[PDB]
Design an enzyme around this catalytic site. Structure first.
Site, PDB file in Angstrom:
ATOM      1  N   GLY B  12       0.808  -1.213   0.000  1.00 48.20           N
ATOM      2  CA  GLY B  12       0.000   0.000   0.000  1.00 48.20           C
ATOM      3  C   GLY B  12       0.837   1.255   0.000  1.00 48.20           C
ATOM      4  N   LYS B  37      -3.472 -10.776  -1.183  1.00 45.00           N
ATOM      5  CA  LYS B  37      -3.274 -11.201  -2.568  1.00 45.00           C
ATOM      6  C   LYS B  37      -2.063 -12.136  -2.470  1.00 45.00           C
ATOM      7  CE  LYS B  37      -5.500  -8.593  -4.305  1.00 45.00           C
ATOM      8  NZ  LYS B  37      -6.160  -7.270  -4.125  1.00 45.00           N
ATOM      9  N   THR B 101      -7.379   3.633   9.613  1.00 40.66           N
ATOM     10  CA  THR B 101      -8.448   4.397  10.226  1.00 40.66           C
ATOM     11  C   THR B 101      -9.740   3.625  10.039  1.00 40.66           C
ATOM     12  OG1 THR B 101      -8.610   5.707   8.175  1.00 40.66           O
ATOM     13  CG2 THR B 101      -7.290   6.628  10.009  1.00 40.66           C
ATOM     14  N   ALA B 125      -3.067   5.327  16.124  1.00 34.78           N
ATOM     15  CA  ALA B 125      -2.631   6.636  15.651  1.00 34.78           C
ATOM     16  C   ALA B 125      -3.437   7.135  14.429  1.00 34.78           C
ATOM     17  CB  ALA B 125      -1.129   6.603  15.320  1.00 34.78           C
ATOM     18  N   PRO B 126      -4.380   8.059  14.640  1.00 38.60           N
ATOM     19  CA  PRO B 126      -5.069   8.677  13.497  1.00 38.60           C
ATOM     20  C   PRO B 126      -4.161   9.546  12.560  1.00 38.60           C
ATOM     21  CG  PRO B 126      -5.867   9.600  15.581  1.00 38.60           C
ATOM     22  CD  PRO B 126      -4.909   8.500  15.936  1.00 38.60           C
ATOM     23  N   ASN B 127      -3.016  10.016  13.074  1.00 41.09           N
ATOM     24  CA  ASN B 127      -1.988  10.670  12.281  1.00 41.09           C
ATOM     25  C   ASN B 127      -0.587  10.464  12.872  1.00 41.09           C
ATOM     26  OD1 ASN B 127      -0.601  12.781  10.663  1.00 41.09           O
ATOM     27  ND2 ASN B 127      -2.694  13.365  10.102  1.00 41.09           N
ATOM     28  N   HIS B 155      -7.999  15.239   1.770  1.00 44.94           N
ATOM     29  CA  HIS B 155      -7.118  14.120   1.426  1.00 44.94           C
ATOM     30  C   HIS B 155      -7.213  13.736  -0.029  1.00 44.94           C
ATOM     31  CE1 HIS B 155      -7.449  13.673   5.805  1.00 44.94           C
ATOM     32  NE2 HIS B 155      -6.232  13.169   5.700  1.00 44.94           N
ATOM     33  N   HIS B 156      -6.203  13.024  -0.509  1.00 38.61           N
ATOM     34  CA  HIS B 156      -6.296  12.391  -1.810  1.00 38.61           C
ATOM     35  C   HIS B 156      -7.625  11.666  -2.001  1.00 38.61           C
ATOM     36  CE1 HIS B 156      -5.513   8.324  -0.177  1.00 38.61           C
ATOM     37  NE2 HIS B 156      -4.933   9.057   0.763  1.00 38.61           N
ATOM     38  N   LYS B 159      -8.658   7.771  -0.719  1.00 41.18           N
ATOM     39  CA  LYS B 159      -9.084   7.571   0.688  1.00 41.18           C
ATOM     40  C   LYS B 159     -10.529   7.097   0.808  1.00 41.18           C
ATOM     41  CE  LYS B 159      -8.934   9.775   5.250  1.00 41.18           C
ATOM     42  NZ  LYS B 159      -8.227   8.600   5.865  1.00 41.18           N
ATOM     43  N   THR B 166      -8.224  11.584  11.766  1.00 38.52           N
ATOM     44  CA  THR B 166      -7.734  12.791  12.433  1.00 38.52           C
ATOM     45  C   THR B 166      -8.893  13.759  12.795  1.00 38.52           C
ATOM     46  OG1 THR B 166      -5.489  12.637  11.490  1.00 38.52           O
ATOM     47  CG2 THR B 166      -6.296  14.818  12.075  1.00 38.52           C
TER      48      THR B 166
HETATM   49  N1  LIG Z   1      -2.390   7.377  10.743  1.00 33.63           N
HETATM   50  C1  LIG Z   1      -1.875   8.006   9.677  1.00 33.63           C
HETATM   51  O1  LIG Z   1      -1.031   8.865   9.880  1.00 33.63           O
HETATM   52  C2  LIG Z   1      -2.246   7.581   8.263  1.00 33.63           C
HETATM   53  C3  LIG Z   1      -1.571   8.062   7.141  1.00 33.63           C
HETATM   54  C4  LIG Z   1      -1.905   7.580   5.890  1.00 33.63           C
HETATM   55  C5  LIG Z   1      -2.906   6.629   5.755  1.00 33.63           C
HETATM   56  N2  LIG Z   1      -3.567   6.180   6.848  1.00 33.63           N
HETATM   57  C6  LIG Z   1      -4.624   5.142   6.805  1.00 33.63           C
HETATM   58  O2  LIG Z   1      -3.974   3.850   6.578  1.00 33.63           O
HETATM   59  C7  LIG Z   1      -4.770   3.039   5.731  1.00 33.63           C
HETATM   60  C8  LIG Z   1      -3.933   2.777   4.522  1.00 33.63           C
HETATM   61  O3  LIG Z   1      -3.930   3.917   3.670  1.00 33.63           O
HETATM   62  P1  LIG Z   1      -3.238   3.815   2.245  1.00 33.63           P
HETATM   63  O4  LIG Z   1      -3.484   5.115   1.513  1.00 33.63           O
HETATM   64  O5  LIG Z   1      -1.904   3.216   2.417  1.00 33.63           O
HETATM   65  O6  LIG Z   1      -4.160   2.718   1.520  1.00 33.63           O
HETATM   66  P2  LIG Z   1      -3.754   1.720   0.306  1.00 33.63           P
HETATM   67  O7  LIG Z   1      -2.703   2.369  -0.523  1.00 33.63           O
HETATM   68  O8  LIG Z   1      -5.094   1.352  -0.091  1.00 33.63           O
HETATM   69  O9  LIG Z   1      -3.063   0.410   0.927  1.00 33.63           O
HETATM   70  C9  LIG Z   1      -3.790  -0.537   1.659  1.00 33.63           C
HETATM   71  C10 LIG Z   1      -3.014  -1.813   1.456  1.00 33.63           C
HETATM   72  O10 LIG Z   1      -3.610  -2.828   2.264  1.00 33.63           O
HETATM   73  C11 LIG Z   1      -3.888  -3.925   1.395  1.00 33.63           C
HETATM   74  N3  LIG Z   1      -4.970  -4.705   1.982  1.00 33.63           N
HETATM   75  C12 LIG Z   1      -6.301  -4.525   1.879  1.00 33.63           C
HETATM   76  N4  LIG Z   1      -6.949  -5.439   2.618  1.00 33.63           N
HETATM   77  C13 LIG Z   1      -6.024  -6.219   3.178  1.00 33.63           C
HETATM   78  C14 LIG Z   1      -6.032  -7.384   4.051  1.00 33.63           C
HETATM   79  N5  LIG Z   1      -7.220  -7.874   4.438  1.00 33.63           N
HETATM   80  N6  LIG Z   1      -4.849  -7.923   4.440  1.00 33.63           N
HETATM   81  C15 LIG Z   1      -3.680  -7.413   4.030  1.00 33.63           C
HETATM   82  N7  LIG Z   1      -3.593  -6.352   3.224  1.00 33.63           N
HETATM   83  C16 LIG Z   1      -4.715  -5.721   2.795  1.00 33.63           C
HETATM   84  C17 LIG Z   1      -4.133  -3.326   0.024  1.00 33.63           C
HETATM   85  O11 LIG Z   1      -3.974  -4.260  -1.068  1.00 33.63           O
HETATM   86  P3  LIG Z   1      -5.000  -4.229  -2.310  1.00 33.63           P
HETATM   87  O12 LIG Z   1      -4.726  -2.876  -2.887  1.00 33.63           O
HETATM   88  O13 LIG Z   1      -4.465  -5.430  -3.048  1.00 33.63           O
HETATM   89  O14 LIG Z   1      -6.406  -4.310  -1.761  1.00 33.63           O
HETATM   90  C18 LIG Z   1      -3.079  -2.235  -0.005  1.00 33.63           C
HETATM   91  O15 LIG Z   1      -1.816  -2.756  -0.458  1.00 33.63           O
HETATM   92  C19 LIG Z   1      -6.036   3.838   5.459  1.00 33.63           C
HETATM   93  O16 LIG Z   1      -7.039   3.405   6.402  1.00 33.63           O
HETATM   94  C20 LIG Z   1      -5.696   5.305   5.752  1.00 33.63           C
HETATM   95  O17 LIG Z   1      -6.770   6.041   6.330  1.00 33.63           O
HETATM   96  C21 LIG Z   1      -3.230   6.622   8.060  1.00 33.63           C
HETATM   97  O1  LIG Z   2      -6.692  11.107   9.501  1.00 35.25           O
HETATM   98  C1  LIG Z   2      -6.677  10.225   8.627  1.00 35.25           C
HETATM   99  O2  LIG Z   2      -7.635   9.428   8.458  1.00 35.25           O
HETATM  100  C2  LIG Z   2      -5.494  10.195   7.726  1.00 35.25           C
HETATM  101  C3  LIG Z   2      -4.319  10.847   8.074  1.00 35.25           C
HETATM  102  C4  LIG Z   2      -3.242  10.844   7.177  1.00 35.25           C
HETATM  103  C5  LIG Z   2      -3.384  10.199   5.939  1.00 35.25           C
HETATM  104  C6  LIG Z   2      -4.585   9.550   5.634  1.00 35.25           C
HETATM  105  C7  LIG Z   2      -4.807   8.874   4.332  1.00 35.25           C
HETATM  106  O3  LIG Z   2      -3.933   8.924   3.444  1.00 35.25           O
HETATM  107  O4  LIG Z   2      -5.910   8.330   4.137  1.00 35.25           O
HETATM  108  N1  LIG Z   2      -5.606   9.597   6.525  1.00 35.25           N
END
Ligand SMILES: NC(=O)c1ccc[n+]([C@@H]2O[C@H](COP(=O)([O-])OP(=O)(O)OC[C@H]3O[C@@H](n4cnc5c(N)ncnc54)[C@H](OP(=O)(O)O)[C@@H]3O)[C@@H](O)[C@H]2O)c1
Ligand SMILES: O=C(O)c1cccc(C(=O)O)n1
Ligand SMILES: NC(=O)c1ccc[n+]([C@@H]2O[C@H](COP(=O)([O-])OP(=O)(O)OC[C@H]3O[C@@H](n4cnc5c(N)ncnc54)[C@H](OP(=O)(O)O)[C@@H]3O)[C@@H](O)[C@H]2O)c1
Ligand SMILES: NC(=O)c1ccc[n+]([C@@H]2O[C@H](COP(=O)([O-])OP(=O)(O)OC[C@H]3O[C@@H](n4cnc5c(N)ncnc54)[C@H](OP(=O)(O)O)[C@@H]3O)[C@@H](O)[C@H]2O)c1
Ligand SMILES: NC(=O)c1ccc[n+]([C@@H]2O[C@H](COP(=O)([O-])OP(=O)(O)OC[C@H]3O[C@@H](n4cnc5c(N)ncnc54)[C@H](OP(=O)(O)O)[C@@H]3O)[C@@H](O)[C@H]2O)c1
Ligand SMILES: O=C(O)c1cccc(C(=O)O)n1
Ligand SMILES: O=C(O)c1cccc(C(=O)O)n1
Ligand SMILES: O=C(O)c1cccc(C(=O)O)n1
Lengths: 265, 265, 265, 265
Positions: B12, B37, B101, B125-127, B155-156, B159, B166
């Site tokens: 991801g 996968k 999230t 961690a929400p961020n 966000h992009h 999402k 956050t």
């Molecule tokens: N806390 C923070 O600071 C922060 C920052 C950024 C993002 N996030 C959060 O983190 C999550 C990921 O964001 P992202 O933009 O990285 O999403 P992403 O690019 O969609 O990546 C998600 C990854 O998880 C895989 N996946 C889906 N279901 C799965 C499962 N059951 N088991 C294992 N892998 C699985 C996906 O594969 P496929 O594509 O093959 O389905 C993909 O490779 C989101 O919920 C987002 O809100 C949080």
């Molecule tokens: O607050 C959130 O849910 C969050 C924070 C950073 C990145 C992302 C994201 O890329 O989805 N989402």
């Protein structure tokens, strides 16, 4: 039990609001104003002020002080006179609240020693708006995490001093936490002189002066792949009147100079 | 003495950065990844990952956990699985760090009770970006002075969840200080449904999803003739990697669930 | 039928993206690069570049040009060499596309006369991002309604030139419509030197250099009780690659120097 | 030769400014006002208005029109009455200038047919501030380059209608150039209802209602690794008075309904 208040610069953009604010505060009496244009014996002789405003006008501060002996003098005049005004007050038993900006570091420090020595309250407020005060407060805290910061400060285009009092105060506050250093590439060149702005202990400050603005600042903290921003916007001069009222009240409780309302929220 | 780390969602957008970050942290070993996968036995079989990355891939978390027994599982998958993943960890002796999230209030509370009961560290961690964490922290404080606030969160456009983690967390934090109430004129009407956004204890939240964005929020506090704004902008996913590293380290020191990094700066 | 392209500064932050972009454009061949560090005979000898990239490296532009005779040279080097590079191209039959910033007005005009005289296409692009180009275009139009404007321009803190190429170009464009004049109160004083920024025909320009930024500008037009703002934010260097591709293509169609992509959308 | 002007809602926040503006325009006479509270026979009987303002007050528009026969009626009342007011004017020989917001698409179209049929000028202005008009104009143009856009629109918290007239008009304008489509991931879910805002032909619109604000909008166009933003901020109600004056003048020159001042700068 009323705070007896005199105001400097009553016809000014801040002055007249503060005139009205003080007139309508029920624990405060406006006992005099100071101008530097003969506008009559009473402020009610001016338009902009109603007939009820029978407040004596003085063109000389020393005269005002000896005749009226106000508890507090609120200065909203010009940088040219700020120091002289504050000093006259501080050695004739009058608590100054200074809205006016444009003290020097040296003059501020001299004022601080005078208040100390005469056990007399003084507030120098670079911003009366509570969101501005909060901005400054958070700047100190943010500076711990993000040593690289710049300040952009924006005001109407009649403002005489750049950078603004608030930007100076912000930078001082930041400077206490932030290690002293230069920002930008060490070999950057300004090919149009002034581009990179003023510098306060290495902290850049940029000043915007346009019609339509009132008073605005943003504080930009650079970090890894990110930017944290603190911002405040005053959209009119009424945003300052709670701070002015708070400052008149607060000055009565102190026996030294307080610089910035952050100390005393 | 190495923290043994497994990651969910390695391919991801967050996953792959965290793969590299953990590979290059010298106190951490990446001992496994979880996908859904079939991408081979080893992560090195994927492109995007070099031949050196001989990290075993699992398609089943329970299998991963029993086979590998990581100290920590870092989840960066999808809202659909977040709860199930966290729960499996919390009752098989694995500290979860959850980037993902989209928990419900109820699921979060259930996770918090499980960590408590198993004396097991967990960070939700929400961020991960330190400026975001700071934003949230200052939101609590600002809420004391300005009861009327709105949140805009951007966000992009890949999402999946709106509002963002956050923004939920921000609102919760605000809600603890801010008296519960509705904002806007009591008789305002939405003539296009949704205009005034979501509502969290009366606090409006608006969500923007556009190409080009990464992660952004602003918090707007209305006051007298003024506006105080807190803002954070992450410009890339590297902005999160210090937070991720900090969270893996921090989770080892705790024996309960911590929601948000604000608690532990 | 392929455009034969050489690039200056291939290892740079812009350079390497443009290397990849040109490698993957199917109507373009990357026939050479120019460096000033011995990094081998072929770019594939560098890390960051794959083994497939068997592109000859030259340390001398004249040598490159005589050996390779590219149709187009894309410069992404440094202000120090920009003029010399462009000039060598323009009198040895090579169309320059100049990303690099930091020409003088005089050097730009000299380059414009050389292109004219040799009937040779040249693009000097202060910004490749289409939103930036649009910003500049709208600045011209807005300037008709709002004669008082300032420019704030923000970039990463490795950038060598302030103000930025874009800010110069913006100001030039504005200056054509806006009557020449000073802004701010005529008696304003800078008590910290630089505060009010650089000046271009009276138009203030302020430059911000922080970590985390990539490239950003805002243009603020003051009016009656209001402010009109144009803003662009590039969040990464990929935002520039469509512009680069467009510029290589476009340069082939012209027989003179074009300054800014606004002319040719 | 004076334009004979009547105003609806003279005591309102817009109303009273427009009263003063029209009183001081030398080519315009304020011949009547319409209220819905008995405030006396003459507007001079109200405080806020001076003794000189001997302008007859009517509580019934039809009565006003038959008694006074103004050339122009300026409506600054409420959405509840806007349609009824405009219609009464358009079939009794009075040119309406409608500041008031909150027509339906259907009502606007009905008004447009009435003006057409009676060869009678009418201006419906969703914003009188020239920077706002400019914003809208540039939105049309920008939409060609960036099909993904959102609108965020912010106003004081006494405003009755969301989204705002300006945001509706912006979206309509955009919708003419922008292909119809949904934005955000096709599988995104709102877990707090309303988060993603209202939708106008797929264009999201978000509405902010806070104390301290006056009138503000931003238009965010997402692109590759970048964001282009158009913004306008009115900081007080005087920002609207040039537009009001322009609209009274302009309405006299037309014989049909004009929606938005963009058409006629
Ligand atoms: N806390 C923070 O600071 C922060 C920052 C950024 C993002 N996030 C959060 O983190 C999550 C990921 O964001 P992202 O933009 O990285 O999403 P992403 O690019 O969609 O990546 C998600 C990854 O998880 C895989 N996946 C889906 N279901 C799965 C499962 N059951 N088991 C294992 N892998 C699985 C996906 O594969 P496929 O594509 O093959 O389905 C993909 O490779 C989101 O919920 C987002 O809100 C949080
Ligand atoms: O607050 C959130 O849910 C969050 C924070 C950073 C990145 C992302 C994201 O890329 O989805 N989402
Ligand atoms: N702390 C804050 O929150 C805050 C907020 C707003 C403004 N300010 C500051 O307060 C000051 C006033 O700002 P402003 O915009 O109100 O300025 P202003 O409109 O210029 O008003 C200044 C007033 O002082 C008068 N004046 C000048 N010299 C004087 C003297 N020697 N004695 C008596 N009166 C004198 C002026 O009269 P003439 O016009 O006849 O010269 C004018 O009426 C500025 O320094 C500004 O930076 C501070
Ligand atoms: N128009 C636009 O849209 C746009 C966008 C981004 C940047 N820029 C501009 O483009 C230029 C490059 O920016 P950047 O951030 O990529 O800078 P950078 O990362 O410093 O890269 C410059 C590259 O040029 C190399 N170099 C220096 N002198 C050279 C020479 N004489 N011959 C060959 N190579 C040389 C450098 O190598 P060493 O490091 O070994 O010195 C480096 O690899 C700057 O002027 C910047 O303003 C323009
Ligand atoms: N186009 C623009 O540029 C622009 C700018 C600002 C505002 N607006 C719009 O203009 C309208 C007015 O805004 P505002 O903030 O001025 O509102 P406001 O302060 O509420 O004023 C409305 C006035 O109309 C009066 N009123 C209500 N119903 C009436 C009726 N049937 N006949 C006569 N008077 C009536 C109200 O009196 P009571 O208070 O006694 O009910 C009040 O004095 C709103 O629709 C707003 O969206 C447009
Ligand atoms: O920080 C300052 O100097 C300041 C703050 C508010 C208003 C003004 C002003 O109107 O000049 N100046
Ligand atoms: O206008 C400029 O000078 C500019 C534009 C985009 C990027 C850069 C840079 O990275 O220096 N500089
Ligand atoms: O677009 C609108 O609806 C609008 C524009 C300016 C002011 C107001 C207002 O004060 O309500 N509303």
């Amino acid at each position: 039990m009323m705070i007896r208040v005199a105001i400097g610069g009553p016809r000014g953009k801040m002055g007249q609001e503060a005139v009205h604010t003080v007139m309508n505060n029920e624990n405060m009496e406006l006992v005099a104003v100071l101008d530097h244009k003969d506008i009559g014996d009473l402020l009610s002789e001016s338009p902009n002020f109603p007939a009820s405003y029978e407040v004596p006008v003085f063109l000389n501060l020393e005269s005002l002080i000896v005749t009226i002996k106000p508890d507090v003098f609120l200065d909203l005049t010009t940088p040219h006179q700020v120091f002289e005004h504050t000093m006259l007050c501080l050695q004739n038993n009058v608590r100054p609240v200074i809205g006016t900006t444009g003290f020097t570091d040296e003059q501020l420090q001299q004022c601080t020693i005078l208040a100390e020595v005469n056990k007399l309250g003084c507030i120098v407020a670079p911003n009366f708006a509570i969101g501005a005060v909060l901005m400054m407060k958070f700047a100190s805290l943010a500076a711990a995490y993000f040593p690289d910061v710049e300040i952009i400060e924006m005001h109407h285009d009649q403002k005489l001093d750049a950078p603004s009092g608030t930007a100076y105060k912000t930078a001082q506050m930041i400077a206490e936490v932030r290690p002293s250093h230069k920002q930008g590439h060490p070999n950057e060149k300004e090919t149009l002189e002034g581009a990179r702005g003023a510098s306060y202990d290495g902290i850049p400050i940029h000043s915007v002066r346009l019609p339509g603005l009132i008073a605005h600042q943003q504080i930009l903290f650079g970090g890894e792949g990110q930017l944290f921003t603190l911002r405040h916007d005053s959209y009119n001069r009424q945003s300052f009147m709670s701070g002015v009222t708070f400052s008149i009240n607060q000055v009565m409780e102190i026996k030294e100079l307080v610089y910035g309302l952050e100390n005393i929220l």
